[PDB]
From a paper:
The bS21m-mediated rigidification of the platform observed between states B and C is accompanied by a concerted rRNA compaction that results in the formation of a NAD-binding site at the base of the platform, which stabilizes a series of single-stranded rRNA linkers in the platform. Together, the replacement of ERAL1 with RBFA, the docking of h23, uS11m and bS21m, and NAD binding aid in the orchestrated compaction towards a rigid platform. Furthermore, TFB1M initially sequesters h45, preventing h45 from interacting with and stabilizing the mature conformation of h44 until TFB1M methylates two residues in h45 and departs during the transition from state C to state D. As a result, this molecular clamp inhibits the premature folding of decoding centre rRNA elements and forms an assembly checkpoint in which h45 methylation is required for maturation of the decoding centre. Furthermore, in states C and D, the rRNA linkers connecting h44 to h45 and h28, which also have direct roles in mRNA decoding during translation, remain flexible due to the presence of the 3′ rRNA-binding assembly factor RBFA, as observed in bacteria.
[name] ribosomes (mitoribosomes) synthesize proteins encoded within the [name] genome that are assembled into oxidative phosphorylation complexes. Biogenesis of the mitoribosome requires trans-acting assembly factors that chaperone rRNA folding and guide mito r-protein incorporation. Here we used cryo-electron microscopy to determine nine structures of native yeast and human mitoribosomal small subunit assembly intermediates, illuminating the mechanistic basis for how GTPases are used to control early steps of decoding centre formation, how initial rRNA folding and processing events are mediated, and how mitoribosomal proteins have active roles during assembly.
Numbering used by the authors:
A (entry chain 0): 6 to 55
B (entry chain 0): 165 to 216
C (entry chain M): 10 to 124
D (entry chain O): 48 to 237
E (entry chain R): 66 to 356
F (entry chain N): 4 to 112
G (entry chain T): 2 to 165
H (entry chain D): 190 to 229, 239 to 430
Amino acid sequence: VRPRLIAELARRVRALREQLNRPRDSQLYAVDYETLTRPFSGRRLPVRAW
Amino acid sequence: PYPPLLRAMIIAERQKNGDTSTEEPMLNVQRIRMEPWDYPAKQEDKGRAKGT
Amino acid sequence: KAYRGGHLTIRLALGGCTNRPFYRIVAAHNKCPRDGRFVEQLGSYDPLPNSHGEKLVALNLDRIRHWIGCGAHLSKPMEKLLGLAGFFPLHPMMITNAERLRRKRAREVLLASQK
Amino acid sequence: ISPYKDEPWKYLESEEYQERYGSRPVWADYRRNHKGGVPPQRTRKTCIRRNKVVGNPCPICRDHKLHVDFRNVKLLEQFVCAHTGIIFYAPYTGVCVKQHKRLTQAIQKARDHGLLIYHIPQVEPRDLDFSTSHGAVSATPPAPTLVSGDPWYPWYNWKQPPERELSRLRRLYQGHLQEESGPPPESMPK
Amino acid sequence: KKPTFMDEEVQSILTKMTGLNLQKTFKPAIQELKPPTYKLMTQAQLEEATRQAVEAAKVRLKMPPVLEERVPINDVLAEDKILEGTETTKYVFTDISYSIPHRERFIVVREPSGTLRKASWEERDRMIQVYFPKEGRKILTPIIFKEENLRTMYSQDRHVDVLNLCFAQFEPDSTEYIKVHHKTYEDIDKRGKYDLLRSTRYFGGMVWYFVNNKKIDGLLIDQIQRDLIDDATNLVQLYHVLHPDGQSAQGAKDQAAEGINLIKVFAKTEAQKGAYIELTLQTYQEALSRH
Amino acid sequence: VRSSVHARWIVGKVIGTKMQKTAKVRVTRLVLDPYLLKYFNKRKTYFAHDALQQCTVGDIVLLRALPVPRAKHVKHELAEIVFKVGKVIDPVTGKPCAGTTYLESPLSS
Amino acid sequence: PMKGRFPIRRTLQYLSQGNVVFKDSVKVMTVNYNTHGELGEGARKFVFFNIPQIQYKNPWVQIMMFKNMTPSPFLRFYLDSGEQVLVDVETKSNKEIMEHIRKILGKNEETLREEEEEKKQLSHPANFGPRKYCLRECICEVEGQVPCPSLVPLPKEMRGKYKA
Amino acid sequence: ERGWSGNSWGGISLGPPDPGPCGETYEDFDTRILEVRNVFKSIRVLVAVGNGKGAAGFSIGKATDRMDAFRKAKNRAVHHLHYIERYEDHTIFHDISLRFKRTHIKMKKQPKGYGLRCHRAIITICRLIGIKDMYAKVSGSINMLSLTQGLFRGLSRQETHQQLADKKGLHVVEIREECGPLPIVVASPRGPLRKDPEPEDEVPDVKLDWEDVKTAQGMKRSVWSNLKRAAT
Amino acid sequence: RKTRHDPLAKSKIERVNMPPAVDPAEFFVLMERYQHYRQTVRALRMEFVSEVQRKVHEARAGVLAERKALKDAAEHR
RNA sequence: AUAGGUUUGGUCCUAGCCUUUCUAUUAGCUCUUAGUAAGAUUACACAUGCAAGCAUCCCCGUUCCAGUGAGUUCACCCUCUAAAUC
Ligand code: FES
Ligand SMILES: [K+]
Ligand SMILES: [K+]
Ligand SMILES: [Mg+2]
Ligand SMILES: [Mg+2]
Ligand SMILES: [Mg+2]
Ligand SMILES: [Mg+2]
Ligand SMILES: [Mg+2]
Ligand SMILES: [Zn+2]
């Protein structure tokens, strides 16, 4: 089997970059009260919570 | 009580094996405690939104 | 084949032809296709009434009990079928639908009386 | 027009049939026209197309007095092997597919009516034990609910919720409420 | 107690009365044929092969048990009135677990009214044939069993074929099985066709029916005419043990009747056609003396 | 359950002894020819651990599977020497033999 | 004609006529026999006629043969436990050898019947599926049930084209 | 009616043989042409005759005119008749494998209703003989004269059940699958019967044919075998 | 079906899934019915699990299996 | 293969080619109705519109289903043992 080292390198780099670029609670759980959407993702909250 | 068909099978097997008890087959539900759907869950096991 | 997560479920796989459905009650991985690979066939269900006016349901109850005891889930139509068989309690939604149909027919009868 | 339509079997003990065929099968002298030494593996579909016969009609279609009927047992026997009871395949006798299907149906009907003798084997019993004592075929003791006329479980019946719970739900679903439903009809409305 | 049809004594009497004709028992079947095989055999080897064939014939002639008509199944497992009117057709639920005897297999019906009940015998048989098909059985009753078709079969002297079809189609304790067997026996008795069932597994059942219905005159006549005097005497003895309180048995005890004397006492006491029995017996005795 | 090696017990002939504490053994099995329906010998090479170096080229040995492979190709060990090359002891009578003749007569004891 | 002496040996019927199914303990069978000498004659026939049948019925059992290594012919069986079973076959006929090995290390007929019954359970007759696995494809093949639309067109009322 | 083909002489009937100089009539015999060949001009014809009851023969006739050749061949054939033994007057007594020169013929006894599954010339000759059920395979050179000669030799050298019983001094017992384990004695020795049984041969040293075995085991895949054909 | 890399449809940018209207009485009765049904079903599932594990234990180290193993070992001896 | 045609002035033998059988695709010409099944040549490039949401916010899902046959002994059995369901 030909070694697949680029895959391992990519996996390790992605893991490192995810554990150094963690989004914080202030970013993840912020809300725009006028539109009731998460600015981090843009996804609208369910109606029953508005 | 057991469901009708399952109760019938339990009784039929009981009679086949020679036992002639008249006691109804019965399901214990004491150990099945019904938790309200809004009871707090384990936050430790919950995931997190991935950065992107 | 390894699926990410998933579980065994007892469900209905559709066979037959156009306008003529037939169901095989099978235990299969929930991620597998509806009519694809399965672990074991646990019965059948012909939804069309036959020449005797009957809907035939075959249930391999020993194997159904075995697979439930092995951690298999159940699709809602399968739960309703087992409720009709008397193997399970009648599903809440069957009772609710029966009550809703009763109320609708009462409304229709009241309309007829009003007219 | 044949005078034997109502009673086809008559044609087989008429002297005309004896002159034409004698004691040999009605298909004995027939021969298919084809290229090569190996014939095609199916016969023609039908010798009669829009009330017109083809050049070489098959044994059944060449004689209009021969009627494929389940009561014409003597004719049907000529298309069944007397030593094995197996219906000859169509290229064996040269009958077209239509008449072969008709003969097969007639033979099956004659066998089902007891008019054609066929081998009926002797089989073993379905079950080893003939007891009828099991609960599957005997009577199961009625459950107490079945005696008392109650549902199998109490929750099968509608119970009006308390007013406090209904008010709590009306507070929870402000502005998205539908008309409150009372207890359902006790029986199915007719 | 009164003997059963499976009693070893009754079984032995009926086995000897049936007979064992190898040529009839192993008549050439009309089926797909294969080239025969050939063996060089001594006299001893031929005798051993004949004995093995006799054993195979004995296995083939084993008598089906005679069963009483099954009682109808009328049992309600539940009455869920909430489901009434929600469905237009009944549901039939068959438990198809492999290792269960078919008479211990749970088959239930959910009716449109909401009643969960047990299946009837006919429904049970139909479902078992649906899911566990048996060679020779059909889901729907064949039309051969109608009155006119069975009359045709009788007119062709194909009674054994009718009984084989009945055995393949119906269960022994079913109403249809009992009715068809009884009508075949009645035809045989009415037309003196007892030899048709000899050396078959149905002769014992036919004899049992005749004895239990007190109509052994025709069979006794046939046995006397075929010079099977031992069979007739055994038939009379079986009649006596089945009906030990009848006039015939008491007369046989009183007169110490044995052998042909038993037949004479039966003809004088409890024969619907005793005069013709006496005539045939006298003819048999006269021919025996002449020979 | 006791081993991860497929071949549990195998009889073979020693064909090599040039490795340290390892015997190279030739094992033949009978394989059916699908077309001819005749059984032919199929050969496979096995490395067997021989701690004492008691194996000689040409002797018939029994090999038992190791619980786990001790090397890339060494998955078995020498359970015993069934037939020492040129030093066969007749298992039936227990006497030494040279081919089909008794070196020591069975009657001698 | 078929090549070789006794070509019947190279037929599947002959190979399946074998009656020795070894227990699961037997792993290896060594057959030591002599090419010459009347006393081992039966053993030679055992190699000629019965080893193919034994191998056919026991594919995973290693069978190995040895010639003219000992004064007498013998069989040795090696078991999974490490036990070895020695069977002297000198002065015996090949039938005697077959019967002996069947008796001492062969599965009895009861166990084989139990295995066959266990096999039967896998092919459940009530299961519907391909002919390769099931007696029937679909419930439409059962008499009295609604037939396939391929053969019998369904009435206009139960078809979606005329229900819409 | 046509022969094996529309333009072929083979299979054509020539009618009954003419009354002979010996004074015998042959109205119960039928004649069939097997081959017609130009000899370089004259004509050589191979014909076969038979009464359908085991009496059959064949002959070569050479003449400048075809009809004279037919007559010569037919008249000579009636005076060189074979008698062919038939098992139950419908088939042969046992399988026959023969080679005449380079032509191999392998014939198999078959049950009733099997019909004649044979080379067309063999079908014609079997109809003349009265054999109604048989299988035959012809291999090697397909030479009509050699085929006819080999067929007649093989059919004339078959051992009946009675001959086998007299030779071995034992009962010949027939086992039929349709008749169960019933032993049917088809032949018994006319002389005394041996009290010693035949050696129960564990494995007979019979020469098997790879075609028969391959057909039995299911590795014969020929698209030409077991094809539907007209009744023969 | 779409993968997580496929963009959302432009026709669905402004879509709100309005929750369905609620009937208080039926809602409450349905909640109670689901609770009771799920309790019964969990009891049945636990019984089936106990049955399965019991069958496994009986197959591996049951009295019948022990006697069979002893008989087989002896008969081999 | 139940075989057949074809080398020579002729016979026999050997030997190839072809015919007869059954499927699939495409082409010509010709085609009425009903039911069912199946349905790009191309791992070439793609306009356009849809194919993943749900839900009192967290999460969960979008790693599935659906598609293709480019590459190609990763698929099967045993041992061991994660993740997952109960
Ligand atoms: S295959 Fe069953 S309906 Fe078509
Ligand atoms: K969610
Ligand atoms: K590919
Ligand atoms: Mg022409
Ligand atoms: Mg050629
Ligand atoms: Mg030329
Ligand atoms: Mg076209
Ligand atoms: Mg784990
Ligand atoms: Zn026609």
